[PDB]
Design a protein around this nucleic acid. Structure first.
Lengths: 87, 25, 129, 120, 217, 60, 206, 97, 96
RNA sequence: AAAAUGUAA
RNA sequence: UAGGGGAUCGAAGAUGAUCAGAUACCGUCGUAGUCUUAACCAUAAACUAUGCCGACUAGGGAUCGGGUGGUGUUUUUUUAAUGACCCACUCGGCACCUUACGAGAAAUCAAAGUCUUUGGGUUCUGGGGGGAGUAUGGUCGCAAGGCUGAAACUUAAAGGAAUU
């Protein structure tokens, strides 16, 4: 989204679903962003160290936010085993 | 009205004019 | 019966993105459907596929992302005359900057702009975006 | 008909929840108690407030009252929350089946095995 | 005399967010009308038409007033104001308040070129309502807003210039014609386009970092 | 219905009305001069910013 | 990311067996819940205790990840977990709403029940279907303690519990507080017994 | 319009049934599309029961019962019988109570 | 398909049913049937002439209550006696 | 069990 | 149509009451008929008012037929063996429950979904309502009727779902 002389034209930049690659728009009142704080030594989650996860409004309308939850959580290292891809 | 009665009306009316056309043969 | 095999593979794919699938499965697959999977893959619409080999027709499990929205077919196989390409872009293509109409030519299964450089023509397959 | 309305239950409720450390089952004191804390308009009106609360005082002396409290009873609730004085882990250890026997065999420890019969 | 409520309303009365783009960015909803005005001073009006809606009673009748008003400006901001009040005057004032609670941004670029300044639309989008489908097609500069008299002045206060429209069904109805257009422009940002196929960091919410000052008293 | 009614009123009300004529009214220019007076008498010095617009108001 | 010693523990797991939180459901088993450790015959199932610790420690990363620890709603439909939700907001500082929920606690800012949350918690996702729609119109995280029967409609995290009642509700919220302090709080290590009593939670008669 | 997915009372899987006769007016009604209730009562009333064990012999006697099945025609079950109709969502109820 | 043949060689099938469905038109029917060339007081014309047969007084219907004040005509190219409507206020004194 | 009807206001 | 049979109910008809009238609704008798043999007639709110095949989008339980497992039970003479039932699973099914992000005028329907993000293959019909499924010819039929199927003229409504 630009023009002949470069520059970023057309205001406003919407988000996107990290589980469905489906853009997050404002008319969705059912999309939830997760804020998982990254803990280190002696615990301490840190007030500014979080991991964001995109789970759209349609995902909640079916209850599938739990499937890609284990999916998106397992590969980053917060879920020791638990879920299995190969089924 | 009931169209079952409208089909009984025309039924006898066609049969009536059928024997009247046979009076010319 | 089973007439257009390409239209059936796209069938399971239409409702696949309507749910948010990360995978799909086609059947029974032909040579034509193979070169079309490479068309979307070539521009970055879908991902890579894996054709499972069996002693029948065949099956392909394509791993899709979420960039693809609508994948359809144009039945039957229509005759194009170079002028049909510049009219069909306004026949169903969402934009004038993006979108590809793939068809069948003698030199291979490609789109209108690639067939533009080589002035090639033949029949028609489907639409992509 | 002769039934209490909105302003009756409403007003009788306010007085009892903020001035409970008083009151009795007497009419001449509960009536003059309405005259010592708040302000009214007429007498007949004031008489109805007092009569409905002597009715409520009789149900408060019998334990719990439906819809009313003042924090004093939440502490009273903690006292009578411990019953039993005997217990109902005493009889044997674990009463199971043949199917529940294979269950302990896969994950547990302080849960022994005992077989039954069952007819499906 | 504004003084709102919630963390959302107090972080706007504090001046931590002067852009309405932050609202639409995190998909967060609206609750107060006066908040959308502290972020959008240039909001203009345009009343379409009022049609008295009647209801029967054990005695006779009792008609109200169905005022169809819209808001927004020449940029990308529009408002949907549906109101049913006792009087025509009350339906005008309270109908504008409702139009603020339903504000949404619109997408439109060029017909097929890339020069400068979005003139036309982006893609083929549509919105339905009851039995009225309204498709939006991109048009070249120099043309005009091609549609009905009502949907024409609607897109005028939408910020767009060139457009085409094709309907199917019963369209003589102001409500469903314009309610389906409110849907067509809402789907402008609901269809994946190549020039927007890069992954975004998806920033942390303002009411998270500013959730320290707007909590309580 | 009635196939044969009464035709005594062929131009009844037409002539039973009073006789009033047209006086010689002020001259109005033709063409370009005429549209010059519409441009001012509706936009420039306007008509009346009372509610909306009137070219044929009331008795006030 | 992984902590340090927040892995598999013999003491933590044997206390979950004294809670009966490993007992499964019956004829019912909702599709999205294939978290079993052997199918128990006679119409029953089993719950993986290691994968259940995972659910509790994850949603807890979202608990202490909220700015002010007071805007956390602790809803309870079950009378069995009413004193349990009162003790959770009593150690962190959140807001408990046990008993009557009332439509207008997330919406309708005119009432004294309305509170703007950043994290929501539910006991029984079946009967609390009203608190489910509340958060689904304002963009806020939803937690639910399901078994195998309760449908996970509009929820983010669905932990495998025992909503049947008994002592299962008081066991869950007990370890939830011990975790909001282990990671940024008044906690120290793993060899920490915690002075608090679990028999203060649970249902007490009458 | 159509208010019941069964129209009257079931008709899926066959497409024809033998019509029986109403017991009150005796109007021919389809087998499955008719109403029949259990009349699992006693021989007498709740009073003349001890009067029987008074005149009869044997120890305490026995006391018999009588079962029956009443067939109606919808018009009969409403005149003052098994009906009282229902509301929109309450019509879909399938429990005896 | 949805009720139709997308057949390359079934071009005539589409042509067959099309003509039969055109007969359902009130405008197409009257056009190719030459309705004016048969009956209709106007045989291919928009203007015609007749002769006054007599002076009538036909009235109106609902939701009204009044008279129409009419007359009678007669085709020259045909010979068919007809009836016409007299416009304006009166002017029956100029017909005859 | 029986118990119909409605002039331009 | 022609034979046989022909209890019962019962178009017609008869008849006592019923109504102002009663050739209806109520009672009673009873011709054809209701059954079968050989020919016909070929229309039904003949409906799931939903044509035929093909694929996918849903959580689950019932339930008929075949199938596979279970150191499950019943039969006992005896471990048996089958047969019966239970539970897991499965195709062809007969339907249902809660939703449907979908579609739909609405009611609603896992189809009436995959329809402006417009095409799997294919059949037949309607194009405001009347007039009128009427006319003429034709055509099958013993007849009744069936099949195909108009015109003149008329009118701004007919109509469908749903809220008060």
């Amino acid at each position: 989204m630009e023009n002949d002389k470069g520059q970023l034209v057309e205001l406003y930049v919407p988000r996107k679903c990290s589980a469905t690659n489906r853009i997050i728009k404002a008319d969705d009142h059912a999309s939830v962003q997760i804020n998982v704080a990254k803990v280190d030594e002696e615990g301490r989650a840190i007030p500014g160290e979080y991991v964001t996860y995109a789970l759209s409004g349609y995902v909640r309308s079916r209850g599938e936010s739990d499937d890609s939850l284990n999916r998106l959580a397992q590969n980053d290292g917060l879920l020791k085993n638990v879920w299995s891809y190969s089924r | 009205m009931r169209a079952k009665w409208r089909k009984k009306r025309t039924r006898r009316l066609k049969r009536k004019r059928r024997k009247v056309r046979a009076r010319s043969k | 019966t089973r007439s257009s095999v390409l239209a059936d593979a796209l069938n399971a794919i239409n409702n696949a993105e309507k749910t948010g699938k990360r995978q799909v499965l086609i059947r029974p697959s032909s040579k034509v459907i193979i070169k079309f999977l490479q068309v979307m893959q070539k521009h970055g619409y879908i991902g890579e596929f894996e054709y499972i080999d069996d002693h029948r027709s065949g099956k392909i499990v394509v791993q899709l992302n979420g960039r693809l929205n609508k994948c359809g077919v144009i039945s039957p196989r229509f005759n194009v005359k170079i002028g049909d390409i510049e009219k069909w872009t306004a026949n169903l293509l969402p934009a004038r900057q993006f979108g590809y109409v793939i068809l069948t030519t003698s030199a291979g299964i490609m789109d209108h702009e690639e067939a533009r450089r080589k002035h090639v023509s033949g029949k028609i397959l489907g639409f992509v975006y | 008909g002769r039934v209490r309305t909105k302003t009756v239950k409403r007003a009788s409720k306010a007085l009892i929840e903020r001035y409970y450390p008083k009151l009795t089952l007497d009419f001449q004191t509960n009536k003059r108690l309405c005259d010592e804390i708040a302000t009214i308009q007429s007498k007949r009106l004031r008489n109805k407030i007092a009569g409905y609360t002597t009715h409520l005082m009789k149900r408060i002396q019998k334990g719990p009252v439906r819809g009313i409290s003042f924090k004093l009873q939440e502490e009273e609730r903690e006292r009578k929350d411990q019953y039993v004085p005997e217990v109902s882990r005493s009889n044997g250890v674990l009463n199971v089946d043949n199917q529940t026997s294979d269950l302990v065999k896969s994950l547990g420890l302080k849960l022994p095995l005992s077989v039954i019969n069952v007819s499906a | 005399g504004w003084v709102p409520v919630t963390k959302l309303g107090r972080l706007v009365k504090a001046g931590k967010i002067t852009t309405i783009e932050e609202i639409f960015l995190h998909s967060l909803p609206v609750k107060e009308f006066q908040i959308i005005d502290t972020l959008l001073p240039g909001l203009q009006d345009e009343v379409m038409n009022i049609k008295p809606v009647q209801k029967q009673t054990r005695a006779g009748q009792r008609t109200r007033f169905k005022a169809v008003v819209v808001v927004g400006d020449s940029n990308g901001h529009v408002g949907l104001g549906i109101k049913t009040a006792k009087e025509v005057a009350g339906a005008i004032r309270a109908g504008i308040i409702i139009a603020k609670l339903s504000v949404i941004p619109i997408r439109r670029g060029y017909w097929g070129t890339n020069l400068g300044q979005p003139h036309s639309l982006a893609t083929k989008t549509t919105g339905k309502c009851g039995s009225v489908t309204v498709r939006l097609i991109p048009a070249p500069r120099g043309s005009g807003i091609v549609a009905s008299p009502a949907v024409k002045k609607l897109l005028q206060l939408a910020g767009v210039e060139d457009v085409y429209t094709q309907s199917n069904g019963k369209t003589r109805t102001l409500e469903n014609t314009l309610k389906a257009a409110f849907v067509a422009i809402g789907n402008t940002y609901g269809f994946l386009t190549p020039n927007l196929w890069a992954e975004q960091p998806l920033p942390v919410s303002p009411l998270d970092i500013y959730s320290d000052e707007a909590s309580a008293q | 219905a009635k196939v044969h009614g009464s035709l005594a009123r062929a131009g009844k009300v037409k002539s039973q009305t009073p006789k009033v004529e047209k006086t010689e009214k002020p001259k109005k220019p033709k063409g370009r001069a005429y549209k010059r007076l519409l441009y001012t008498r509706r936009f420039v010095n306007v008509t009346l910013v009372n509610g909306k617009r009137r070219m044929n108001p009331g008795p006030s | 990311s992984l902590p340090a010693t927040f892995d598999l523990t013999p003491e933590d797991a044997q206390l979950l067996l004294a809670a009966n939180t490993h007992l499964g459901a019956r004829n019912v088993q909702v599709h999205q819940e294939p978290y079993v450790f052997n199918a128990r015959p006679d119409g029953v199932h089993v719950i993986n205790v290691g994968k259940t610790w995972e659910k509790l420690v994850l949603a807890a990363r979202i608990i202490a990840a909220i700015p002010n620890p007071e805007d956390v709603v602790a809803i309870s439909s079950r009378t069995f977990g009413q004193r349990a939700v009162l003790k959770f907001a009593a150690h962190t500082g959140a807001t408990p709403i046990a008993g009557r929920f009332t439509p207008g606690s997330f919406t309708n800012y005119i009432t004294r029940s309305f509170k703007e949350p950043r994290l929501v918690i539910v006991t029984d996702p079946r009967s609390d279907a009203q608190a489910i729609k509340e958060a689904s119109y304002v963009n806020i995280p939803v937690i639910a303690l399901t078994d195998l029967d309760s449908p996970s409609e509009f929820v983010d995290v669905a932990i495998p519990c025992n909503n049947r009642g008994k002592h299962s509700i008081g066991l869950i919220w007990y370890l939830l507080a011990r975790e909001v302090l282990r990671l940024r709080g008044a906690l120290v290590d793993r060899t920490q017994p915690w002075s608090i009593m679990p028999d203060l939670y649970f249902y007490r008669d009458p | 319009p159509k208010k019941r997915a069964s129209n009257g009372r079931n008709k899926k899987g066959r497409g024809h049934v033998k019509p029986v006769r109403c017991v009150n007016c005796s109007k021919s009604i389809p087998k499955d599309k008719a109403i029949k209730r259990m009349a699992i009562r006693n021989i007498v009333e709740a009073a003349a029961v001890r009067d029987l064990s008074e005149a009869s012999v044997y120890p305490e006697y026995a006391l018999p019962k009588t079962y029956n099945k009443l067939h109606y025609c919808v018009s009969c079950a409403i005149h003052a019988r098994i009906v009282r109709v229902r509301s929109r969502e309450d019509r879909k109820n399938r429990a005896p109570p | 398909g949805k009720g139709k043949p997308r057949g390359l060689n079934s071009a005539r099938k589409l042509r067959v049913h099309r003509r039969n469905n055109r007969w359902a038109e009130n405008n197409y029917k009257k056009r190719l049937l030459g309705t004016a060339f048969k009956s209709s007081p106007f045989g291919g014309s928009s203007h015609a002439k007749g002769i006054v047969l007599e002076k009538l007084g036909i009235e109106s219907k609902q939701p009204n209550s009044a008279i129409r004040k009419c007359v009678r005509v007669q085709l020259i190219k045909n010979g068919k006696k007809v009836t016409a409507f007299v416009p304006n206020d009166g002017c029956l004194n100029f017909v005859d």
